[PDB]
């Protein structure tokens, strides 16, 4: 339901709660940017003859 944030370690009886966040927002925007450049190069070079 996501009213508790994290996951469980049942072989030690712990909650590995999540506060393991950092940024992420920069890193995912660079991935979206990075995937369009592959499709764009493929598209442009393929127009030649």
């Amino acid at each position: 339901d996501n009213t508790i944030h994290g996951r469980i370690d049942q072989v030690n009886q712990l909650l590995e709660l999540d506060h393991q966040k950092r940024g992420g927002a920069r890193y995912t925007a660079l991935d979206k940017w990075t995937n369009q450049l592959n499709s764009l190069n493929q598209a442009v070079v393929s127009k030649l003859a």
Binding site: Q42, V45, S46, L48, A49
Partner: protein
């Protein structure tokens, strides 16, 4: 370095009398524009230089340059069939079966001839690629004896053998993705190596190659996978990205001189 027909013939001499080493600085350089003014050149020379240059690089086990060399022998414009075009295609399927898990893409500026004529011409190879996608070596093995006479007459024997070892490498490497720790006995049954001793032998070959990051536990009779060459915060990675930028800035500069050249020419 401008590319012309003496380049093809250099590779031919090396191919017959093995001593691939002198030819390599010519090959390892990529270029734009052929040597012209007064003839002395045609599309067959272009195709044969790249066919052979692929042949040599696969041999060195430089699968990266081979793939690229092989591709240039397919992308060439043609409206007629030739013996080099069949061979170039067939060698391409075998190489892409090593590098990739199925055949690697071809652009849409490929010649018409490679689709229309060459594909029913290369049926056997399409069946190699199909069996490889099932991911079962026993079947791939049986197919190679069925298809054998073709392999010999076309003389891309021995390469066809590599595609079989590369499936076993793929089959080991997919397990890495899935498992942290797996047994050698377990690896051996599933991969169909059929001997844990060989499981240990196969990863150890790959450790030296650097296709795998792993460690062997012979107390437990396990393999432990690592997988951590880069954390991406190394200055080593910064320098590598910085080196890659210098390449791009020069590549763009070639394009500027060539775009400008068309700007001087009057448009149609």
């Amino acid at each position: 370095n401008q590319l012309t027909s003496i380049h093809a013939d250099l590779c031919q001499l090396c191919l017959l009398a093995k001593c691939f080493k002198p030819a390599l600085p010519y090959l390892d350089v990529d270029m734009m524009d052929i040597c012209k003014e007064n003839g002395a050149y045609d599309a067959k020379h272009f195709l044969c230089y790249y066919y052979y240059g692929g042949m040599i690089y696969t041999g060195l086990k430089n699968f990266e340059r081979a793939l690229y060399f092989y591709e240039q022998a397919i992308t060439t414009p043609a409206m007629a069939v030739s013996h080099i075009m069949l061979e170039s295609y067939k060698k391409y399927i075998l190489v892409s079966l090593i590098l990739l898990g199925k055949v690697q893409q071809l652009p849409k500026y490929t010649s018409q001839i490679v689709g229309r004529f060459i594909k029913p011409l290369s049926n056997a190879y399409h069946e190699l690629a199909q069996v490889y996608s099932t991911n079962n070596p026993s079947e791939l093995r049986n197919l190679v004896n069925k298809h054998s006479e073709t392999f010999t007459r076309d003389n891309n024997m021995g390469l066809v053998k590599q595609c079989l070892s590369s499936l076993y490498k793929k089959n080991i490497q997919r397990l890495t993705k899935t498992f942290l720790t797996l047994s050698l006995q377990d690896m051996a049954s599933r991969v169909q190596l059929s001997g844990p001793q060989e499981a240990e032998k196969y990863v150890l070959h790959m450790i030296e190659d650097g296709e795998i990051f792993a460690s062997i536990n012979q107390k437990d009779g396990m393999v432990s996978f690592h997988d951590n060459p880069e954390k991406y915060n190394n200055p080593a990675m910064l320098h590598n990205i910085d080196q890659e930028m210098l390449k791009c800035i020069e590549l763009d500069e070639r394009l500027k001189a060539m775009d400008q050249e068309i700007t001087v020419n009057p448009q149609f």
